[PDB]
Structures are given as C-alpha cells and as structure tokens.
Amino acid sequence: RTKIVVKVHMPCDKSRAKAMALAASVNGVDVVEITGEDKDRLVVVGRGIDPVRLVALLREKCGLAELLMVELV
Amino acid sequence: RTKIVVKVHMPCDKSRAKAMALAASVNGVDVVEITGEDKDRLVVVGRGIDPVRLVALLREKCGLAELLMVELV
Amino acid sequence: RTKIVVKVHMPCDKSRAKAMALAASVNGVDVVEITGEDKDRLVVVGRGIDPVRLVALLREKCGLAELLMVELV
Amino acid sequence: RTKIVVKVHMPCDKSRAKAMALAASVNGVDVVEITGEDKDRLVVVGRGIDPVRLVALLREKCGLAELLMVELV
Amino acid sequence: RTKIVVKVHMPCDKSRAKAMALAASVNGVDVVEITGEDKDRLVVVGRGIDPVRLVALLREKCGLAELLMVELV
Amino acid sequence: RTKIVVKVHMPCDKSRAKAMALAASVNGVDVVEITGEDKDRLVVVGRGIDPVRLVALLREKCGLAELLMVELV
Amino acid sequence: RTKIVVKVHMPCDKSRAKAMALAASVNGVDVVEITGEDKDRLVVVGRGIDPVRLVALLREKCGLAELLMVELV
Amino acid sequence: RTKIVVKVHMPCDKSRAKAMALAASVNGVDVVEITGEDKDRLVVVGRGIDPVRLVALLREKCGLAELLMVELV
Amino acid sequence: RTKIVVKVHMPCDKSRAKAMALAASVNGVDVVEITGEDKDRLVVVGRGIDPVRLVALLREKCGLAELLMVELV
Amino acid sequence: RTKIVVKVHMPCDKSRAKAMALAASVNGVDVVEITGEDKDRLVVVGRGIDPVRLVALLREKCGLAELLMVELV
Amino acid sequence: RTKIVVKVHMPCDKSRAKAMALAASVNGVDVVEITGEDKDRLVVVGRGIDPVRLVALLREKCGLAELLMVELV
Amino acid sequence: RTKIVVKVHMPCDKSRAKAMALAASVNGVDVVEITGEDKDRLVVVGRGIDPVRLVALLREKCGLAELLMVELV
Amino acid sequence: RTKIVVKVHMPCDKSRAKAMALAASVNGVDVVEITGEDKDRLVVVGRGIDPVRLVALLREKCGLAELLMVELV
C-alpha cells in the first residue's frame, strides 16, 4: 500500500469532485481525500498505483498537478 | 458535514473503482474510502450529501447497495 | 436492531434522568445510556425505533436535542 | 460507579418500558439495559445508587423483583 | 401591571422562539418568559396589553393557544 | 425444468454457503452452483422453482440479491 | 478443488432437498447436484471438503450414505 | 420369534435379490420380505436372530443398511 | 403379482436357508416364507416368476421339489 | 427420535401413573402412553432414549417390566 | 375420556419433562404429549381428570399455564 | 373467543341465580346462560377467561363444580 | 409346610389360570389362590415347594414374576 499526495488546482466544487472521481477510478485506490489549509492536497492511498500515470491523467483532465509525496504505509 | 457508510456489492476492483468514483463525483464529498474485512463498506464524508439519493445512485450502477450508517461530523 | 445517538443538553441529574427515562419508555428500546466526555450523548439501542419520532419527543418534552447518528447493528 | 442486575417480571413491552424508565429516573444512573436469555435481567449502572430502594421501587411498581448482582467497576 | 400565562403548542425550540418573539412584538409587553415542565407556557408581563389580540395572534401564527391566566401584580 | 441466475452479495465463504443451502432446500432443485469470476452468481436448476420467492428468501436471509436470468430448460 | 460423489438414499424431493442443502452448507462448496439413472448420486464440488465429515453428515441426517469417488480437478 | 426391519438402498433388483437372499441365508429366518412404498424395507422374522449381526452382514456385503425396528412377536 | 407354494425337503437349518436364499435370489421375488405343519412348504411371491423354472432349479439344488400351487393375488 | 414399547406390571391406576411419570421424567421424552387390551403396554417416544436404562428404571419402581419393541421414527 | 390442552412455559428439556411427569402422575391419565409449532401445548388425555386441579398443579410448579381446551372423545 | 360449560350443584332457583351471578363477575365473561334438562349447567362465553379461577370460584362459593367443556367459537 | 406369595403379571383370566394351574401342578401343593386388590398375588401353600424353581416356572410360562414372601407355617 502506497500514499500519494498531489497538489491540484481545485478552486470550486465541481472541479474538486472532478479530480477526486478521476483518482478514485484507478483500480486499487482505496482512499481518496482532499486536505490541507487551502483544500489543495489530493491524497490517494491504494495498491498497484502508478503515481506517474495518475498525475498525468490529472494534468490532462484538470489543470496543473504537482507530485509531492510517494510513501509506503 | 456528515459521514455515511454504505454496504455496496463491489466484489472486485473495477467495481470498487466505480463506486468510489460515483461517490467522489458528488459535489461536497471530501472523503471516499473502502473498508470492511470483506471490502464492501463504502465510507463517504462531505457536506450536504443526501444519503438516500447517494444509496440509490450506488444501487443504479452497482446493482445492490444498503445504507448502514449516517453520522453528523 | 438500531443504535441512535442524540446530543442533549442535560447539565444536571434531573435533566439527565428526564431524557433517559423518556427514551426508556419507548417500546422496543433495550439499551439507554449517557456517554461522552461532556455527558451530553444519549445512546439508544433497540428494535423498530424511529429516530425522527424519538428526537421529536425529546424536543417536545426536554428540549435542546440534536440527532447525531443512526446505525444498523 | 457500581453495577446492579435485578431479575424482574417483564413479560411484554409496556412492562419493560416502565421498569427501564423507572431505573432511568433515579438520579446518578448512567446505564439501563435489558439483558438475559429470557429478557428478565434489568442491568442498572450509575453513581450513588442504593440497590435496596431501587429494588424496593421495582417491587412496588413492577411486581416481583430479585436483586442478583451489585458490584463496583 | 398585568401578568398573562398562555399555554401554546410549541413542541420544539424553533417553535418556542417564534411564539416568544411574536408575543414580545404585541403592544405593551415588557417581558416574555417560557415556563412549564414541558416548556409549553409563555409568561407575558406588561402594561396595557390586550390579551385577546395576543392570544389570537399566537393562534393564527403558532397553532393552538389557551389563555390560562390574566392577573395583576 | 427452469434455470435461474441470481447475483448475491456473498463476500465470504460462510455467506456463500447459506445462499447455496437456501436454494438447495427448495423442493425440486436439482442443481445449485456458485459461478462467475467474482464468485457472486448463484445458479439454481430444478422443477417448480418460483424465481420471485427465491430472491425474496435470499434477500431475507442473505441480505442483498438481484435476479439476473430466468430460463426454461 | 475436489469432486465428491456420494450414494445417498433420497427417494423423494424432501430428502433430495435435505441432502442437497446439507452438502451446500459446507464452507467452500460451489457445486451440488443430483445425478444418476436412479437419482441417488449427489455430486459435491468445492474447496476444503472433508469427505469423511461430509458423508458422516449425510448418513447422520439421511440414514444411508456411501462415498463413491474422490477426484481432483 | 422376532421381527427386524432394515432400511436398505436397493434401487434395482440385483441389489434387492442380494440383500434378500443374504438375510434368507441366516439360520433361524422363516420370513424375509421387501416392503414399503419406496421398496427399501427389508423385513426379517425368525428365532434367535441377532439384529446387530444381520445389519453388520448387510453392511459388509451390500452396503447402505440401517436398522429400523426390532420387535418380539 | 403371483403366489407359489412348493413342498421341499428341508430337514435342517442349513437346508431351509439354502432353499429360501435361492428363491430370494430370483429377480422379481418380494416375499419368501417357510410355512406348513412339517416345515416343508416354501412360499414365494413376486413379479415375473416362472414357476417351472423356479421348481426346476429347486430340484437341482435341494433334491425333491413338488409344485403344489400357483395363484394370482 | 425413537419409539419404545415396554410391557409393565401396572394393574391399577396408581401404578400406571407411576410408570407414566417415570417415562415422562426422562429428558427428551415427548410422548408417553398407556396402550393394550390389558393396559400393560407403556409407549414412550422421544430423543436420545436408552431403552435398556428405561426398562431398568421401570423395573426398579414397578418391579416387573419387559422390553417389547424399539423402532426408529 | 377427555382431552386437555394446556399452554405451559417449558423452554428446555428439563422443564418439559417436569410438566409431563406432573400431568402423567394424575390418576386416570393415559396420554401425555408435547405438540405445537412452539412446543408449548401439553396435551393430556384420560379418564376422571379434573382440568382445574391439574392446571393448578401445573401453575404451582412450572410457571404459568393456560387452559386452552377441554373436550370429549 | 371461548365457550365454557360447567356442571354446578344448584338444585333450586336461588342457587341457580347465585352461581350465574358469580360466573358473570369473573374477568372476561360476556354471557352466562343456564341449561341442561335439570337446569344444572352454566354456559359461559367470553374472551380472556381463566376457566380455572372461574370453576374454582364456583367450587368455593356454590359447592361442587365440574368443567365439562372449554372450546373456541 | 411353606407359604409363598408371588407377584405375577396376569392381567386377564386366561393368564391367571395359567399361573394357578402351574403352581397347582407342583406335587405337595394344597392351596393355590389369587389374592390382592389388583388380583396379581399368587399364594401357594404346601409341602416341598421350591420358591426359586416356582418363580422360574412362572416366568418361563407366564412372563413376569417377582417373589414377595417365603414363610414357614
């Protein structure tokens, strides 16, 4: 199990649901949550997640997406 | 902000992803989580979520779902 | 069976007993307890107990009651 | 706080509810519970309860009452 | 110097606040307090109050209302 | 003779057993099987099977179930 | 997995259902079937089946049971 | 004399002849018959018949034998 | 179904059992019996029995067999 | 569940009551009955009855008894 | 000969044998039986039985007992 | 809904009136009626009657009383 | 001279005669009598009576018998 933290631009709600649903759609993901002072940290925890192709999908479908953390549990 | 626990028929991983992404796509949802020894408990946390509509939508796309818990956070 | 948590403003023993005896008179109720570091959580467990009706009746008789949780056991 | 168990004649639901509401009505009571295999064991937990007047109050309003356990926790 | 007690149908805190504010709006009332074991009684004190208009407005805007007492102080 | 396929939330082996035995205990049933990649398809073959009754029994003593197919052999 | 064939005295539908439900109730069983020109051979397939325990259960509740074959698949 | 009934699985007639000829081979036996709507009841009457020994003989050579009755005539 | 009576020379235990086990051995027989004042009458009832064949093989294995009665029941 | 018929010396009705109450007091016994033209046949039906211990007990308190029949139901 | 049906609280085996041995001990009783879906119908058949003193004795030592039927044969 | 017939010793009209009045007083009695060739039977009809206390009362206050019939309508 | 009393299971007149004639057939016996409220006591009085042999004779040809008394006259 891995923990991924992505800084994403998600000003409103329809866009924060957009990022959340896209990360949730990756097989193996068992936790998705938005955290941080500025509602800017998408954290994805699961198994068999490729952090690279996940952040690529975020950038293609949302906006800027920087990968801040990839850690084991 | 309320927390909702739904028992959902999601026996594999493409089906867990589809329930996670469905819950995630609801505006105001902040946390979607897979839990339970049998991995059939969808935990959903967020603002102004309608648990009845949520469970009906899970029922539509996953075929079988049952509300277990609604809690004010 | 079902577990229901109501937050009730019951600062002294008489208001505590009023809320607890009231919930205990509801047919189908097999557990009542006051919990929480603030001693403000009324826990009611039983069969066929309607959450809305119980809060309504806490509001009619004692006042200062808020539904916190409803959970299948 | 202490724990008290009284075997009470409680055949139906009007009878459980008045036994339970009676115990819940005494000051200091934290927990009231209907236990046992035949639903005759009224568990009462709380502070400063005199088991003697409580069973006396139960005999006086719910028929035969049998003090079976009092113990500190 | 007249004191008025009205039994009102107000079985929740929202309802109790509404009946109290309406009572305090009528000409001549100095003080509105709520009383009664189940918080179903307004006490209204003042000079030059018409209790007929007071109770009739509570009936129109807040449901059922019964004038229990009109007495000097 | 008739074949029926029911999707059933039977995530573990104990609940698969109870779905199997429920179907098996219907008089006339010649075949009960757990099929499907996700081991969630109960197939029943026999004489005088009532599909609606059987799903209802499955719901009642198994939780969630959905009729997928009724076929005459 | 393992296939088991047991000869069982089950001359009517109620005793066919009895033996069939009995085998179905064994954890790990995914196939139960009545075969044979004489309708007296029940086929049990699944995982972790203890043949002695199964046949002894059939005999203890149906009177007559005789293990014919144990076959790996 | 003594009458013994054994339930025997004898679906065809080589198995019926085999059980019935073997019970007849027992010295002391002056009646054997196959009775029952299921034709599964081997009845044997005679003098000095040991029921335990006869059923053991049936189990050794035929299999699928169960003692149903022993009565003095 | 048909009834046959044969006078057989069967003086001792072994000879009765041999006679009766051979009649019991014929397919279709469902009762065999030794009646008669002096032990000598072998009663055989069943379906599709040929009396001449039966007596023939009795004479071959027990010496002297006389056919006394053939009757439909 | 077995049925047991015992011949018991119970010539009057104080002694029939003695035998019937002793059979009745055996755990698992659900039918006791006086039968026979001479009213000396005690019929006992139930679960886990030991016929020999039962006859021995009848013999101890009624003086004479003899086992006549043991039958599976 | 009269038939008597008493509803008796006899949840375990020791308790059903206590009631039965008490009814069997009544002179003139020739049948005692437990029936009903819930095994709570004590059936007593015999001669010169007073149902009143019988149900009184039942209540005196086996909880409560309700006389459901007195009828002739 | 039950009908009770009591043979009562009441050999004159004063006695007949007394026993009927007594029967009409006990709980659950709706109708009392005198019958029999010699006007010696009570017919008592009602719901929730204890026949034991009824016949015991007649025994205590009006002499001999035999419960001939307890039966539903 | 000696007197012997035997309890015999002789529930009809046919078997009382068999017991009587048996005791009478013993050389040296000059009194045989059926005594007792329940007519089950055989009294034998005479010379050279073997009590054990007589009871053995009674059992062998009368069924059940129990020696009650042996007295020298």
Residue numbers in the entry:
A (entry chain J), B (entry chain A), C (entry chain G), D (entry chain M), E (entry chain K), F (entry chain D), ...: 997 to 1069
The authors write:
Several rice NLR immune receptors, including RGA5, possess an integrated heavy metal–associated (HMA) domain that recognizes corresponding Magnaporthe oryzae Avrs and ToxB-like (MAX) effectors in the rice blast fungus. Interestingly, RGA5 and Pik1 encode NLR immune receptors with a HMA domain, which acts as an ID directly binding corresponding MAX Avr effectors and mediates their helper NLR receptor–triggered immunity. The rice NLR immune receptor RGA5 recognizes corresponding MAX effectors AVR1-CO39 and AVR-Pia by its HMA domain (25–27).
The RGA5-HMA2 domain is contrived based on the high structural similarity of AvrPib with two MAX effectors, AVR-Pia and AVR1-CO39, recognized by cognate RGA5-HMA, the binding interface between AVR1-CO39 and RGA5-HMA, and the distinct surface charge of AvrPib and RAG5-HMA. Since there is a positively charged patch on the surface of AvrPib, the C-terminal K-rich region of the HMA domain would have blocked the interaction between RGA5-HMA and AvrPib. To circumvent the issue, we generated the RGA5-HMAK/E variant (K to E mutations including K at the 1,071, 1,073, 1,080, 1,081, 1,085, and 1,086 sites). However, no interaction was detected between RGA5-HMAK/E and AvrPib. Finally, we contrived another RGA variant, RGA5-HMAS1027V, G1009D, K/E (henceforth RGA5-HMA2), by combining all the above mutations, which were confirmed to resemble the native RGA5-HMA structure. Again, we performed a Y2H assay, which showed that RGA5-HMA2 could interact with AvrPib but not with AVR-Pia, implying that the mutations in RGA5-HMA2, which do not affect the conformation of the domain, acquire the binding affinity to the originally unrecognized MAX effector AvrPib. The data obtained from the MST assays also confirmed the interaction between RGA5-HMA2 and AvrPib, which displayed a dissociation constant (Kd) of 148 μM, compared to 31 μM for the RGA5-HMA/AVR-Pia interaction.
